[PDB]
Amino acid sequence: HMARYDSLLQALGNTPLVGLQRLSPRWDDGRDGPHVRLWAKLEDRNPTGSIKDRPAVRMIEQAEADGLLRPGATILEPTSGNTGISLAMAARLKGYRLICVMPENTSVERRQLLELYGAQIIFSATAVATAKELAATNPSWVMLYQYGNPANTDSHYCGTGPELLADLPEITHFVAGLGTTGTLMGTGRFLREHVANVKIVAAEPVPELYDPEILTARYSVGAVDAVRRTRELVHTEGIFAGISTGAVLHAALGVGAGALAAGERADIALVVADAGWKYLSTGAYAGSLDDAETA
Amino acid sequence: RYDSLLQALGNTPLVGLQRLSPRWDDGRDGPHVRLWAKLEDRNPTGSIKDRPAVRMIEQAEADGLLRPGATILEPTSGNTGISLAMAARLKGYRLICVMPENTSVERRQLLELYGAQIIFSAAEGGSNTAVATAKELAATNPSWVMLYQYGNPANTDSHYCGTGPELLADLPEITHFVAGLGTTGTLMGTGRFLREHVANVKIVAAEPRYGEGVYALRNMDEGFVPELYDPEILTARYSVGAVDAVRRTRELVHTEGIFAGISTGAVLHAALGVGAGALAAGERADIALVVADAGWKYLSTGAYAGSLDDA
Ligand code: NA
């Protein structure tokens, strides 16, 4: 056997790390100085197509270990995004019910994805407070809470970090998007403990998992530049990524440019957190950057 | 560990469907009947067509048909076009997809993003005219090449050398292989490999009912039979209606958490039919089935929400 699993759950993580030879400022070492390489960590190769499969599964497992979750329990989560899809897949497979709590004016598209994965939906007028109230009514109802759960960070410490170090011992920069901050905090803390002078770079446009002393830089990124980079990535490297990867790529190229102009070697790992599919029903990929920007 | 996205192809997971299998666990009263899902959406562009796409280009290079700034013409608007657009671009070729004017903007939009140029042929003439147009275009110079996925032995060979060996490696106990029939490459290549290496293996095609299309699949009575097709390879063919394909697609994501496209519903319907028969006969079975692509591109089609009649 090489890739035989008894459950979809076991096929989580161990995602490919792929060299971006065209988009890299300098892939080859040569006459004008050392290489500056970009390496995409493809987190859309997870069961539900996003990096949130990692925290989702570890949150549930940690809750089981701590005695919070038991055979017929229900999981409550205030989300309408990748975490809810991830939790819906994982909950169901592990024997739990999942209720997602979201605003009444959440997009039908988001809502319908959750429902197809078997999540029940409760609408709030706020979403977080109402999940916590719902959860408090029943000892068998549990809110995992992605924004404050250390199992989120741990999933990257124990999974994303190690995998990167294993595939890229020469790593000089890790770049990722800042949401719950679990990817940056978990991966960042692991890489700092192992790679001597590694830089941890956030791409964005106090979080409860945040640590003031992990991040070495933070890059803010506008939507036009995010879209621009997302289209560039698919046209030049064949990778069809979501909109947060556009932010991450803009930042990684800025870092790469820095290393190129300073005549230093870089091996920059960048997170591709999901694929472009869920974002099609918008302008991001077809037409004008302005139409996309409005989407 | 990959220098190119092209290298992150194949070696896809095989995952047991413990809930949907007719009987996952052997009992004192009967042996197991297991379903194993081969997840071909874990490829570069999210489908099984990455395999033949890349092999067809490389075989063309081997044969001296393709060189640096050549143009590939393919009469396709589906997954093969997406896959050829990605591979072609990474390998330094231009890709032009020829399709009927009638083609969905949803379909066109995918090919455009990946960098394909699009040529529209007449709606009335369908794919036959699209193919003729591709071929007439390719004839206008020696540097313009049509790969022709319905007749290209590299399509078959990509499964004979990839899909088949991977399956045997992960599932030496395989009794049945089930996949949808489109170009026939998957069935023809995987099926030939498996028949050569696994005594008494059954190769089962899933096809649409005449007149009831299932995306990416072809009924061979209704349609042109691909030149790749060898009828001797199959042990069985199952026709599947649109409603059965859709209900199984939904069932798969609800029960196993795998969000697959509609051809996979048809494959699952056939696999469960083969499984139900093994179970009734008291036979042991390990049934590998292809999950050829993910549900994402199909969600605009109402096939995942609302009533089965509407879908
Ligand atoms: Na509770």
Side-chain angles (χ1 to χ4, degrees), chain B residues 253-264:
Chain B
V253 65
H254 188 78
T255 309
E256 297 286 352
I258 298 164
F259 179 41
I262 91 136
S263 73
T264 299

Side-chain angles (χ1 to χ4, degrees), chain A residues 3 5-6 19 45 92 235, chain B residues 2 8 14 18-19 89 254:
Chain A
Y5 307 95
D6 274 11
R45 312 283 273 254
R92 164 72 41 96
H235 232 226
Chain B
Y2 302 99
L14 188 69
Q18 304 187 53
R19 296 208 206 255
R89 185 151 294 250
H254 188 78

Side-chain angles (χ1 to χ4, degrees), chain A residues 59 77 144-153 180 207-210:
Chain A
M59 285 189 290
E77 190 73 18
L144 292 175
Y145 198 50
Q146 63 178 321
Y147 289 108
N149 195 322
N152 179 347
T153 298
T180 64
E208 209 182 322
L209 295 177
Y210 181 67

Side-chain angles (χ1 to χ4, degrees), chain B residues 213-226:
Chain B
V214 173
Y215 301 113
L217 269 25
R218 158 188 313 261
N219 176 296
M220 280 192 298
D221 295 306
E222 190 178 15
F224 181 77
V225 164

Side-chain angles (χ1 to χ4, degrees), chain A residues 25-70:
Chain A
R26 188 193 319 294
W27 189 262
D28 310 322
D29 296 301
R31 188 175 188 92
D32 304 329
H35 64 54
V36 176
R37 299 175 150 173
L38 259 46
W39 300 89
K41 177 62 160 161
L42 304 185
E43 294 298 319
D44 60 306
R45 312 283 273 254
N46 283 310
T48 66
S50 94
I51 196 177
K52 297 300 204 311
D53 289 344
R54 300 180 187 263
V57 174
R58 184 167 263 251
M59 285 189 290
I60 289 172
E61 294 173 314
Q62 189 62 48
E64 282 166 341
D66 294 333
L68 304 187
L69 278 188
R70 305 207 293 185

